[model samples]
Target chain A: DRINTVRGPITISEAGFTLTHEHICGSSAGFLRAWPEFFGSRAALVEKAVRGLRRARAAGVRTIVDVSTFDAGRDVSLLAEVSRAADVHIVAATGLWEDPPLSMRLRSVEELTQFFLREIQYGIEDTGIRAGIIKVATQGKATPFQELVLRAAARASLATGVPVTTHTFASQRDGEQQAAIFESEGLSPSRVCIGHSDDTDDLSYLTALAARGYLIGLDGIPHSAIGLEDNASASALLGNRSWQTRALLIKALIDQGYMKQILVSNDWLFGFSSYVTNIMDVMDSVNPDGMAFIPLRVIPFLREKGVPQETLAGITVTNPARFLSPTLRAS
Target chain B: ISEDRINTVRGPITISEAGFTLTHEHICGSSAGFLRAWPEFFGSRAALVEKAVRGLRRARAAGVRTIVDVSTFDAGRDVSLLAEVSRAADVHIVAATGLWEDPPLSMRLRSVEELTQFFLREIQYGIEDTGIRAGIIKVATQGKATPFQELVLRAAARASLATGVPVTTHTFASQRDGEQQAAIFESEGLSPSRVCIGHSDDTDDLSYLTALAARGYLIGLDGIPHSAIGLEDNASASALLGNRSWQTRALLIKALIDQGYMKQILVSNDWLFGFSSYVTNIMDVMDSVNPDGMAFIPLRVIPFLREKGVPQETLAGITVTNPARFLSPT
Candidate 1:
């Protein structure tokens, strides 16, 4: 089986030590274009990203799925550039963040399906960098507009074998609703990954969906600066747990025999906003190893908890392959 | 760019400062009698300001950075109160210098040029001698233009041409007098861009709205409660056409946006905040329907548009950018 990347199709197994959900760089629409000074300029930011991806490479990370959608400032052209420079396999996404643009908002589910199809099959805009995955997100409950986006993503995912990943408000524990929407579209759970799943310690909510075949993003590891920022939204719904709590939860999942459905990642975003405060380097202090944090911190914690390297690789490597190992639909 | 400055009750501000504006709302749509008895009915002038201040702060919290108070002198446009509210709520308010549909004999006796200078002085000098300039000129028409209403429209056009502030109008949408007002504006040499056709929610007739919009006029969908909630329809019962559901209005906005009229649009509640007294009590009516008040465009309408799939940027254009562009002195 093959999965797409910023550099094009690669054998699914070649996606070794994968971060199933991550962001190389993300921001409000046009923020990166207007204020390149955040990362000190575009090329500087690319080189900065290359250094981070290279650090992950040294830590045995091979593939990274950049889940930053276009609205949240997913720059695939930059992703392609950094993928080549970093010698890292990069998988970009096609979809909206929480805030869909007016043009996209007005588009019907069928119309949005066409949009996601064009991005997944043909390319994302004129750069011709086809998205490796379909990204759709929900914050609160699934709003009707967000449901439209989710349905569009589901349709596009079903049509193409570009497996779907999602951004979920983990504390809300609405990953099941996300899985429900995808499965309602006649989509199999094996192809969908519910990301940000580790923000809360909801074991039943975690295990039930994992049992249903949805790839659980144990992605919120090392609950630190950026993690806490994402987890601030988590605390609004449920208590924010520590990194130890997250590792113990992972061990609990592994013991329960759901390791195949687990995907580990460091959601390392390079930029966002309080309008030009530049989150690009702020997380440098939080995760000193950048994308290497899963290996540097998470794997060590797992290894210390009586888990073997073989099981860790199943999470960091084998699981992502299965997640992207799509059942391509006939035209 | 300096020429793109607009007048708020706070004085002249850059058009960019006029963020997320409601183009045709009356902050104090009260009778003169009501104003005199403020202490007895509303507990004091301070209490009334506090109430307005509270509502405006709520609006400000929901991203309404500016508003055009289409309250003519007859409609209780208290400039000092408007100035104080602008500072208190930290929202820009563009006060008006024009008339509603009915005018007294003294107002009608003045010639078109006399009315134009009266409006121009309000723009150049100050309205009610407060030195706070009027930002936009307003005029009104019924189903068809009456003789006096025609003169007011003509005067508003002349004032807009001379002062460069945009002319926003009140019209009986059922009568489709926006078209009549636009023809008069076209004849009076008012640049089409420097005009906004108001109370557009009353008629779901897309062509009538777009016909004025295609001429470069700003189309104000200023009455969510009045049009969509069927307030007037409920009142008239069977008479005037008022049964257009909110969905129909949202879809019409979507159609207009898709047809490339995104920049030529505005939305507001057109809420009258100043009415609660004996003999004429319309206070609780608007609240029962439009509880969000000035924030209705952001809190209610935009969400509905988003659900129907009117994207965020188009909402920003309609709610923010277009109003600034429309109200800025050309």
Candidate 2:
């Protein structure tokens, strides 16, 4: 059976596919434009974005998850078209991100919970694509507002079987905090992915997180200077010997047999011009042919090092596929 | 943008210990008071003027920026003093040009146009004059919309139309007056971001605070630490920052920021007289101590916040950037 993805809602392979976090349309640009401060006019932004998408399509991306939800900027109609044009599957989502709603007059937890369940489920039920794998956010503190967003997000996830993702600026415990909120709702730890795990100076914390069985996401790969600066973790895992060296870390965990609990994805966004271009979207960034880093770089190295093809495929495929399955996805 | 969607609901998110601020303390107060407190506050207008001159330096040394001096109307706020302060502090010192808080001295007969002209003059001459700026358009309501005060505020909003300095309102202990004061602001075609509902912290009603904050008004929580929390009136203030209200205000701030509504949040020590030193010291500690019983945003408030939990980008939001964007001028 086929399920649509976040790259743009379209059916794609369950195996050997990419798990890049993405957004097909402007998230809050619409309402943001109305304010005229944070963004320019929406019409202009959408037009600029359309050009960027056409560029990404040529780069060979299969599926992505639009992590921006409800009040955070979820534009569905535009997303559907981007999916068609880019041949990417998009997993739509709903929920709060962080630092409160940016406006206190926002909907209450219960109000948002009801609305998001419908929006997410409706998107998935009507479209055959996954509604959303997880919700996302980033707030500065444990203020009651962040707690409330977490509660609402947890409820939405429970009702829809979706998971959660979030950014961490001031606090490193963002993942733990989000997990706690989810746990309060009776959700398991395995389903969540604390993004920007690479930002922390502590690897033991990440290991402990992996030990807890949740995916310790290390997104924003390869780009050292630009991007969100996550590649530092990837680099720190093992320097230039690159992904091959990094695989040793992964292999150590896999040998310990913690493979089923891992999830990996490129949190690359096409909105920025660095990743956008007509000929090589992912190709330019990932440099799939000769680039010797990121997944592409590591995969080839894993092949020559006598790692079994099955083991290699697990990181590239089976693990993520199994994780997305409803039984495991929600658990 | 939606009227129902009053994105910016409240004023600056400050807790009880905003520290010592000069409420009626200015280089020049209602004539006699100004001269009376002169040496005690600062010896002469030159000393007071030098307070403006070296204001930024003293403020920076003391880690005290963001002072609100209620020198409205005849209790002149030597805009030049602020100009010197801004130049000295290198920190933001928002100024006000509203009608005085008390009934005017009979000599300064009040007209809405005259008050507006005076305030607009400060924005134009004072800001442009010494490179110091008046961040907000200050006005006072006797806790109710007196026709005169309303007209003055309307003029301030009109002068603000092109200039963009936000309007801040003053009231006394009663919240009833605050509601009418807010109505007058709205009636003048000023959006909530353009106006701040100040001194309403004296009220105990949640509905009142929420109602004022809910309409995207900058719900002023600038209460004195020794007084507000000391008297246990903090719960009401804390309740305003409760998760729901906090989110509402945050979202409002965010929406206003997103919508380009600048200086949507206003914070002050609400200090009066020689009490300035006391308030300043109290505010200084909040950054390090979890004054409001919350360890979050720790370094006293700003510095502690800078210390543990916040990064440059986020810090820029609650501190440097948000204020720059919220206020008319950066």
Candidate 3:
């Protein structure tokens, strides 16, 4: 069986050293609508995305899940070009972000599920790039509408046997809510990944999610300075900056025998469409290896803390591969 | 003084000055996401707008005034185009803020408070700097009310409460889902009097319609010419349940009037000029369905109701007064 890719589906074994959550380009439609020049130029954006993927490929990344949902203007058209030049497999997502498009928001859960399944099974529109994952999110607070999306994503996951992942505000403990909704939809915890788990330092919270058989994304490590300062009181209460706490927490989970449930990635955004300027500063401050943040920096840091290379490899390779496996075997 | 009047896309018109209003109608209603994703499939915007202009002119010629265009932004509601059509047709067109039954992904992620604020902005300020403030908030539910639909209903209620604008809805009438919609709005402290339960004519359950009306909810006997033919298609069975003909709808309205539920009724064609996926021209679909199109209500249904002993006052109440009071700012 083949794993679905941006260009098309490829053999499962071809998906090597996969980073299960990342973004090549993420767009804000409202911004794009109001200001066409918000992302500068398309050429510059594509070049930046290509540069990052090349750097990651050089560090031995074979596959990456571009978790940029349709709400984020996930251009599979642009992604196809980037993946070709960078020589990496990009498994695009089919779901909404924390803020979805107004069009998607008005649709029923059943309708959204059908839309996602179509993208998963029959590719997105005429573009042969089928979505391999369902990316959903709830930021800060879990509203009823957000719950609808979580349910829709879960339903889509169950129907397609594609794995579901989420963007959660861990400080709000919305991961627990995500699990509850997914479980309610009859989706196995193993088929879902609670992303942005690294944004918080609560060992108990992380353990609770991992104990339930859900893959906890200790993704977005080192680049935690983005929202940590604004949430300084919460970070202070947890006793450290987000990046330092996430590293320690991952090791704590490893010690707690929850190594099998961990997957690691940088949540890196290389394109200018993200609308977040000074990304170079963000990368330099945390990941000196640039796109090689987890493979190069975080793993070595975990190694220095006496964590086994095998466990680290499991987080980088085995756990991700297992997580990406179909819940129902493909014929 | 102008703030007190309802702002239609054509221009502001006093509530009392409006007459024979069709409480539910559409210009270019479709899945906004689908159109945005595949704009080529919908044909050119200019051609669609021209078709809409032609449809609304037919509506105007049929003695319809102040039509509530419940096409939400999610349904490809172009306010600028609505204004243009309204000007050409010379019919007062009240636009809506909220969403259709099938919402897009972006709107699904918004919180109730966020949605409430957005709708309130549309009412208090204007829709997208167009200066044409929306006169109503449209919310919708499918077979049964889901949490997201409830959120939308609640948001619609909240927006109505905030701006004093009335709320309308798309209900799966056969499923008796209007009660669920009413309950959510009531819970949000909105009077049922301010809410219009649309698509009621799809079902023949008089007790269900009467019960909602008793609770003070306006009944939308919309969708005339839907099941005009003697034959009923099983494929659209749920939507066509008990909706046999305009004669059946007229009889239902007459029955409601005889039962003193006349004050809680509204009527419309539910005609769309151009939808997203289907026919490029809505006239083709209308002609195939019923040759008369928007004139079905004024020409056929009204005369049938009148002959059935529905008084001039009762007909006027159903057509004009009830809808005006429901849409009037409380």
Candidate 4:
């Protein structure tokens, strides 16, 4: 089966060595709506994301799921532009973010189902660049209305062949709660990728969800910048362990025969709003490898642990190929 | 641009799909913490569900189609039980999620944002992960508002604003506490149109009730003839027709209807199926005095309003249209 991307549909094989979660352009909601000029030049932002993806391409990344929903300032034109420039298969998402505006919250599940259906089938608001995944978010738990959107996403996934990805408050067992809601809606565990599964060191929680056949996203985007000196209270929401702790957790899952379920990424917000610091510009000062951190550090570290090359390739290439390809039940 | 819907325990149903709805009632009562702590007190969950099914069945037999259970976790809100009742009885039970009572140091210690996030999760996801999402927010005032109580009020209001689901507050209507709740909600920018002042039947002050109606809130004439007007338990049926409590409540409805606030009036008997001796058996509805159960509004309360010169259409609007509008996420 073919996979839908910002650059258009391609065979599943074309979706090689995919980074299951990443954002090409992430910013505050509605900031670019009234004043695109205020957020700096769009061209510069596109170039920055392109550089990151190009760096990722050199590291064998062929596809990227831009998991930013509408509220994340998801720009279709930018995704397409960056997809072309970076030669990366960009999968846009067509689902509401966690904190939806009042108008979105008021919609019925059926209305939301129709909205997402149109994005996957009819294309996202006239660009014809349809979304490849239905991404939803839940705080340590989902609000009943957030569940409505989740239900809508599940319904849309069933109607179309696309898979569902989600943002879970990874430090907690929210991923299990998300699966319960999805399974109740008749969605197969294989049809969902529980994103942000790497934000915590809870091996039991991650292993349990993976045992259900869910694709576990080991995306290290949450609190990625936090270190010893910072004392933010919100840091507690993230596991205090280092990236190596996440690496070993990944190793444990792989050791437990869940290598097929694990997919890793930087969970990188490629380019921020013009005001924020561009890490790509300062890659030398920090995680020097930039977007290629998972490939340069994580995979090599797992290899040093004597994890076989085929298993690593399966986690990087084959697993995503299987997860990215929709089950295609009916439509 | 599509038709609006109300979230039921069964799932979302469109406005036209709802009918003769009771805006305020508790289908069953059991605390979430206590259910696990003292399971024996509940008797058999299986046995209780049969009674719940039968109780709602009678309500459906009398043409009741939907109910808004204003029972929060404090009110022993169990969505799993409500869904079971909905499955068998074919009645749509819209469960509420919000805080209650005036205070408690533990919950009071939580800030408004934390409380709002808690409520939002229940609304977007299911309560206790039952996948049966709550349909509305139920915030309450004990007698006077405490600082924590005000915090709960603000949180409930925020949840209502964030989600299109409306807010229904338990007010000490006799003391004009509905007005106080309104001031707090108004400050939070929750429109009066999105709130229903609950327990409004206990008050007899026409000015107080009409003032709330004038301010664009639904007047919940919900507490009705649960013990007095119905036969049995009273040794004699003497309190039936001439019962002043019933008439005073009846007169309040007639007044609100006359004030051209028919659309703002929601009529119901705030019947709780499992209680009397503080028992948790759902079978209580089966051996009850007013066996009309949830159907008490249509079977008995409507006839009382009809006896007081209230027309069928007006009663229909109060019972059917108002709750649908109030509950709908428009």
Candidate 5:
């Protein structure tokens, strides 16, 4: 019939709006071996994450972006199984995280790129499973290997026509480097979205990146506590200023005509660390302690503050949906 | 316009062009604040003021073009001598304003709004309207959390918000408490990215370092190497810098660079008299140490790791492109 319709266990052509970041299956054995609790009670992890997926689907979240970069696991088979079990779309990624301890060893940039390209084409290419977006990671500043990673992803993107989102460590340097490598590789600015950009404090940097016609990432909050240090907690970090700052920042970026380039996700992963039980709890535990979960907390705050429906939709629906759509797949 | 004359602060002043150099130490003062915090030692302002100028002139002799008596506002230790000495040496003077306090001054602020107004005034007008561009905003936080310290920090952050000037904060030993300091600013609704989290060598915790990096918070890893020596933890910090395990400590510097967190990293030295007398003391360490460390992979350590079979192009992002891109913005 089609060159590929159902790649693995999931295919999502039906839905209203969607989120392209999520983790269905547990990640690699590296995370599992180090902390058995993470993979322990597989039935529990599956039940929670799958339950969360169903809830999201019920709430009109049509698709999910499960970006498991690096040692963070992305068991494609399990992802396929979960997507099929839950009847949701799962978009997995191929890349390394910030070379942290507990991170798994990753191939060089070119090797990773080749690996991802093969997956996108023969493995997951519109084949039956959907490889909707390509993922890249950046340090506070881009390292040469990271640049190679970006370049490789961009090349594969050209071949596959998938949009690329990045890990960016939320620093200004990451944005600049991502744009530089993406542009130098001849990738359209509109085709690249810097993820976790919501974490940056430099408005000028954010505005500057947005000015270049690249998407400004506003998905800065972490839904659950993943043993991140105190600062990683959004409530402790953002307080009352979080929503206003992000709203003003995003609105400013959008006003400058960079809205179409923007996209939003929780950047949420279920099987991230070893302690996660029932991956769906990843969603339920989101907005936990009211710290970093701004989209969950501040959206309503902003709405009550008189932000327009279109504005909310732009961040939650319109912008993300537009950017993540297969239709916008770049040439 | 002559370069000899310092440029105007609030407006453009027409001055004859000549070789204009920053006669003053780009690093402005109160380096001994942390040392003086403990009971055993108390720092002398007069001593620090003299030492600050001593370092300033060494920098001047080392091809510094101009100097500013930029101690801001600790006490009138006659830091104007920095300007006077530089002027004698034919280096133009640009004086800085505001005050650097030892925990005491930071706690005086009654409210965030009041502190913000004070900082605004400090930048808006020179010390009592002398009209010399203040040249900098100097504020600090403590190694440990205290209510007074938090209030004062909020004040400084408020000032940064009101004045739109870059701020430098005291991270004490290292940025272990950086998250708390950032929380204070974020709570005050100030931009933490504009604030420099000073003293990177204080802590060897990779997560402590990266947590700040993740928030787009700037890390001020100064050049004063002597301060880092003679520590039992020195071996631990060093070990964290050159290993390969997933839990490798050495990943701290590289992780920052790899993730585009470099914009928040600044070049500075807490160069108060007590730290070192040499003008280039701390910077010399940066020159000697590999800022890229091992995470640069093929670039810096490849020859050393060639036996391990490293690839190329790993260093370019950290050395050339990352910094260039960080400073260039979009």
Candidate 6:
């Protein structure tokens, strides 16, 4: 038996070629909840998402871990239908994203932990789909409120025995800080995957992070700089890194024998409704096949760079399986 | 005879090579204060360069050969970064030495001669050892020409005379500040033909624009996407004018053309890819208003004008020859 999927539980082996960190549709929480008409009909967004998912599925993507947290419009109900249409298994995430709603902010740590657990143990809202992972994020550095959310996510992870993932600004070297929090909360650092670690080419940083018994997310493959507004505090950090250095550094990590602790994914969003749509539209023109950038480009480039097949498999298959095993062990 | 070349951020290029140009635009313009306080917020230098390269690549593909980046020092003008982007994008870029509406205190204290010398050196020699000289002089007046703004304008005029390059102005078109700008340029013994009045399109006053054009000034119908972000006053006032409708702007341009002011016309987007303390990013502001970003003119507006019976020759003159003539060395 395996952990819960949007559809139901599945065998661990059946979750083949899993992308550890991604989003099928990362809509802005504030906008989608307030005004849904800006992105046009739900059917149109679903059609766009299905097209991208089908393309990924054809490239051997059997499963994707969608870490679009509540702030990022984590619509489990919509995700369930998207999965059913695309014929791919999606493991839903339950945790407060970087920019949490006022509702999450008003609550205490204990309350938020209970909320995350309820979503994981039961299901989100009236839907019968349970989340398989807990997602949390930090801007440049975690504020007191961000720390509160992180602590609650850790508590939830420990309570339900699920894995925890993080969104980090790799250049700030804050992933280490996030790992410190998980370690402090008495959760095994091994169960936490620090994401966006690929935004930097610093080998020492990656090695040190992996040395601390945490999984590193080199998730921004063929990344582009996206922002909420011009000169807005949030966008400047979220705007990511150099694509040329992304694969080379991964190769270096694999050569250094840290393949087991590393995971590769393209944090490419198929449907995002925010100020980012225009920027994303321009970015799409630059990379016509954005969703397929990893399977079509990065994977082939890694192979050409002399990354051994077993090591590539370790990043894609073995590493994800290891990180997710604890969550499914009870099943 | 070998014709004179304009000094672009990358290097000198002949004016004719800069075809169908957007004379006013920005790549990465950030104020010094913001840079100090939130340098990390700007991301890695590589990430910013990539953003510029992507935007400019699309621009080049759209047939824009040159862009005049009028980011003044107070407005976060980084010539070194601009030069790097010019090279990467494979497009000619003209850098400027001028002040925005917000002049720093030190600049406000400087004498006209001192300011003139500083600008002249940036043109005659180069800006800060980059070996890339400025092609034009820029000056600005807010709602009205304040005493310090008058000093900057005179300095810009003197610099233009000394370097044989032209001067451009950021004006409050609603206040008819372009007229004040032209009068001051005349007082400083600068030819009206050598001055391009910026943001003249923000006003629908045909009489005001025509009057300035009649004085031989280049009227910059530069604010292509009026729904710009970070604009405090213009966007707010525009709500009363149907959110600064482009059709209103187009009609104003058409009225001027009907009055035979085509040669005096210069069109641009004034599009910004980065932010400064003063203005917001045009990309973000464009999200709800007009998401076309830098390609608003060539891709959307030009076609709109063409369909409305604006002759192709007049369009080409406004988009191409006018800016080249205005920026060309005397």
Q: How does each model score on lDDT?
A: 0.75, 0.47, 0.76, 0.74, 0.49, 0.75
Taking all chains together, the TM-score of candidate 1 against the true structure is 0.53
**What digit string (tens of lDDT, one per residue) describes model 3 on residues B210-267?**
9999999989988866763643543333233344776676677878888888888888
TM-score sort, best first: 3, 1, 4, 6, 2, 5
The fnat of each candidate, in order, is 0.00, 0.00, 0.06, 0.00, 0.00, 0.00
Query: Which prediction has more favorable DockQ, 2 or 6?
Result: 2
Residue-by-residue lDDT tens digits, candidate 4, B1-330: 797877788888889988889888886654333232223333546666776788889999999988888877655566777888898999988988886652222234457876787688778866764677788998888678877789888998999888888988887776899989999999999899998898787777889988888999888887675444444344323332123465577577888888899999887777766631232222343345566767877887788779878888888888888888888874
lDDT of 2 by residue, A45-66 (tens): 4554455554444443344566
Q: State which candidate has the highest TM-score.
A: 3
lDDT at A329 for candidate 3?
A: 33
- Candidate 1, residues B69-168, lDDT tens digits: the string is 9877545467878888779999889999887743432344456766776678778877754788898888887788877788888989888888788888
Number of the top candidate by lDDT? 3
Estimate, for each residue in B1-330, the C-alpha lDDT of model 5 and write its tens digit.
Answer: 797122223322223321223211333333211112111111333454454455555544543333323344432212333444444444444444333443121213234554455456545654332344443455555567666566567767666666555555556545366778778778888765666665554556657777777777766543322233333344533432222232222234445555566545443222333322122233334224433311222232324323333233443333233222222211
lDDT of 6 by residue, A138-157 (tens): 87789887888889989888
List candidate 6 segments past 4 Å from native: A30-34, A225-241, A327-331, B1-330
Q: What ranges in model 3 sit over 4 Å off?
A: A1-331, B1-3, B228-243, B277-287
TM-score of each: 0.53, 0.44, 0.57, 0.50, 0.43, 0.49
Candidate 2: how close is chain B to the reference, as a TM-score?
0.59
lDDT of 1 by residue, A1-331 (tens): 8887888889977888888788877664433443354456677788788888899999888989998876666767788998999889999898777655333444568767877887787777557778888888898699887999899998888788778888888779879788878878888888888888888778898899999988888776754542545634333322445667776778989999998888877777654442223233445555678788889888888898799999988788777887777676857
lDDT of 2 by residue, B11-36 (tens): 23232222222221232333211222
Give the CAPRI rating of model 1: incorrect
Q: Can you write out model 3's per-residue Cα lDDT over A92-205, one digit (the tens) per residue?
A: 888878545445555667767777777787776568778999999988667777878888888888777899998988888889988988988888999889998887778789
lDDT of 4 by residue, A1-331 (tens): 8888998889988888888888876653433332233235566667767888888889888888888776565777778988898898888888876545333454579867877887788776557888888989988777888889889999999988789998888877788988999999999998898988877778889999999999898887333434632633323433465778777878899889888788887777555542223333332244555567778788888899999988888888888888778776664
User: Please, what are the lDDT tens digits per residue for candidate 6 over residues B1-330?
Assistant: 898698898788887888878888877656422332223334545677787887888888888888999876656576877888889988889998877765533345457876787687678877755677888888888777888789899999888888789898888889999988988899989999998998888887888988888889888888767752334466533442235667667666677788999898878777766653432332345435655556777887788888879989999988898888888988
How much does candidate 2 score in TM-score? 0.44
